[PDB]
Write a protein that binds this ligand. Sequence first.
Ligand SMILES: O=C(O)C1=C[C@H](O)[C@H](O)[C@H](O[C@H]2[C@H](O)[C@H](O)[C@H](O[C@H]3[C@H](O)[C@H](O)[C@H](O)O[C@@H]3C(=O)O)O[C@@H]2C(=O)O)O1
Length: 351
Amino acid sequence: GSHPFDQAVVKDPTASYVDVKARRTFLQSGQLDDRLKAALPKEYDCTTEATPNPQQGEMVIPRRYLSGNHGPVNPDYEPVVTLYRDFEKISATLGNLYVATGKPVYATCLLNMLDKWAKADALLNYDPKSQSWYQVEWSAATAAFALSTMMAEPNVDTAQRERVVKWLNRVARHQTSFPGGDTSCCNNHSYWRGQEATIIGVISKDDELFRWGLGRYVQAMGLINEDGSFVHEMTRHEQSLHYQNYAMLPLTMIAETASRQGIDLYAYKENGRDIHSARKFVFAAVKNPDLIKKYASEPQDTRAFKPGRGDLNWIEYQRARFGFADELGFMTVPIFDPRTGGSATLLAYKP
Ligand SMILES: O=C(O)C1=C[C@H](O)[C@H](O)[C@H](O[C@H]2[C@H](O)[C@H](O)[C@H](O[C@H]3[C@H](O)[C@H](O)[C@H](O)O[C@@H]3C(=O)O)O[C@@H]2C(=O)O)O1
């Protein structure tokens, strides 16, 4: 690819994106404050519950509107996207339960679900020019994050785990083989493809994929403005602040994942700008929305900046590592986001 980390190697395929053993221990012995307590997943008998089935044949995400970008809604849209969002929610929940309890039963449930999708060759047949391309990057990563926490679990069908891992590896290699257009080549989608390749590169011990993934993080650092804003996200009008925050989600996971492999991505800078510059801009723009006026004149949609929104999951990981202050008071209720490993409060928050 040609970047400072084009020779990086996958050191340990079972390292995951957090220290599972150590975190489980803290959750089982330590004294959890009210916030952490509220984040504990509720146990359930997953062995007798069926999960979403994969679409058969070609993967097609219907258009949201019968025609154009607005107006009459397409009734086929809701049922199809829900199928994927349920798949992602269940995958992340089982991953989080396995971390918190350590019970092999949750790993068995996850594998049974994923084996169903692998056998059907899901997330592989689609038009790369359609919405399906984006749906794949989110769903493959979500399942990969959950599975990465149980790569060292001995009490599970090992042949089944191998089949699933090969499947995810195929899914990621195919999805990232497409370049994307003038924006999707290099905006937050590039970073989502980045976290997908990184976590799957690690569990499938595929150094080439792992390297390609780290390369998206590098690409992003060079697309940061003097004030910490992302070049491509500041072109989204009333959604500019939303996308600035959104891009922080996958970039944070690539860095957290790389860190468990002995690589310090967070320390990587380009022209006096790094990921911290981006974090500081998000916090400053939420306090003073006038800063966005240099890029867009429209009033900003701030739906993502409410306590409890999954969009804030990246703050739990970064705060746990760097210890900066919660300036905006966002970290009150627990946060859960399937696409960035489930509950960051459960997996990283340390009172
Ligand atoms: O995370 C929440 O707590 C949150 C609560 C809400 O009431 C909604 O259910 C909200 O939905 C999210 C959803 O979880 C995804 O994050 C979705 O992601 C979209 C991105 O925001 C971009 O628009 C991207 O281009 O498309 C993504 C997609 O289509 O999945 O955003 C919604 C939302 O913000 O409404 O979650």
